[PDB]
């Protein structure tokens, strides 16, 4: 959120002017999403999965 | 006489003895209302037990810890988790140690096959700072894993 996380850069600009604590981005920055599309252009799919340690549910991260 | 009737699962007789106390001028203390609550709770009567607790509160008497733990045990046996939580909150409001009653409630909920509500109450108490016994920890872990509930 100081380089390329578009959504989190705008929230950091807002919280620091009100002084209300900065949370973790938790999403992928635009440099990783840029890499995924380029790999898609080579007919390669790159998916990021989160496996819950509670119920072992596989969650597909938006990328 | 009141305790003899209460041990015989006769709440109506206990109320008779309480009205006899009222007629004779003897004010019913927390012990008499505890006997009435126990009489109602022994024969699985939650509504009458709560009515007896309401009578004790309206009488101005402070209920004993035994009355509250009997009520929470009755609620756990019936599976009434929310009523047990309300009773625990009342016990906390009356400056009482709710750890033992919390253990009783969760153990009864486990015993009567109410594992979801037992897990909910146990987690509420654990996040609240209370510590359970080793046996209760082992029981919760083993039962949850037997049920296939890895999250709890």
């Amino acid at each position: 959120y100081k380089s390329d996380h578009i959504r989190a850069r705008q929230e950091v600009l807002g919280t620091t002017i009100i002084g209300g604590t900065i949370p973790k981005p938790e999403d992928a920055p635009e440099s990783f999403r840029l890499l995924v599309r380029e790999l898609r252009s080579l007919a390669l799919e790159l998916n990021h999965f989160l496996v819950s340690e509670k119920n072992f549910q596989i969650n597909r991260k938006e990328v | 006489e009141l305790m003899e009737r209460a041990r015989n699962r006769d709440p109506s007789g206990v109320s008779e003895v309480i009205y006899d106390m009222i007629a004779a001028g003897l004010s019913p203390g927390p012990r008499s209302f505890h006997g009435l609550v126990v009489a109602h709770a022994l024969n699985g009567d939650e509504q009458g037990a709560m009515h007896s607790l309401r009578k004790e509160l309206g009488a101005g008497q402070r209920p004993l810890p035994e009355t509250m733990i009997a009520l929470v045990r009755l609620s756990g046996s019936k599976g009434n988790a929310q009523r047990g939580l309300e009773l625990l909150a009342a016990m906390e409001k009356l400056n009482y140690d709710i750890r033992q009653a919390w253990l009783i409630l969760v153990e009864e909920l486990v015993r009567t096959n109410h594992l979801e509500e037992a897990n909910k109450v146990f987690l509420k108490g654990a996040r609240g700072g209370m510590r359970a016994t080793d046996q209760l920890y082992d029981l919760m872990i083993e039962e949850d894993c037997k049920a296939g509930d890895h999250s709890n």
Binding site: - | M3, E4, A6, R7, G29, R31, H34, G35, V38, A41, L42, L64, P65, E66, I69, A70, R73, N95, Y96, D97, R99, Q100, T133
Partner: protein, 119 residues
């Protein structure tokens, strides 16, 4: 419940709030609760009449134990106060037996007040 002793058998503790000013409830009452013969049936209430007989018999046992000792606790305290030429271990033994007698007397008084407050 009468003496406001809460917690599991290995963590008996006086609340010290509901008592207000009752100096009677201390570690001696906890020891009595841990050593007195007791019965429990979940939520079965006790009949007062049986409690009177039980506490009378227990007080008889305690008084028999006190009688088994050649002296009393008050005379032991008087001996300590008048003591001027004894070793440290001498007073230690005197205080040990005096403390045991005090514990038995505390048990007796606790049973008395428990049977009184049962109503």
């Amino acid at each position: 419940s009468v003496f406001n002793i809460f917690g599991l058998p290995e963590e008996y503790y006086h609340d010290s709030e509901l008592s207000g000013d009752d100096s009677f409830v201390d570690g001696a009452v906890i020891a009595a609760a841990r050593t007195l013969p007791t019965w429990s049936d979940i939520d079965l209430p006790p009949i007062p009449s049986a409690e009177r007989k039980a506490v009378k018999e227990l007080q008889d046992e305690c008084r028999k134990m006190l009688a088994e000792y050649p002296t009393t606790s008050e005379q032991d305290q008087k001996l300590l106060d008048s003591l001027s030429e004894a070793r440290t271990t001498f007073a230690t033994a005197v205080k040990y037996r005096m403390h045991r007698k005090m514990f038995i007397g505390k048990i007796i008084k606790a049973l008395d007040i428990y049977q009184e407050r049962l109503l």
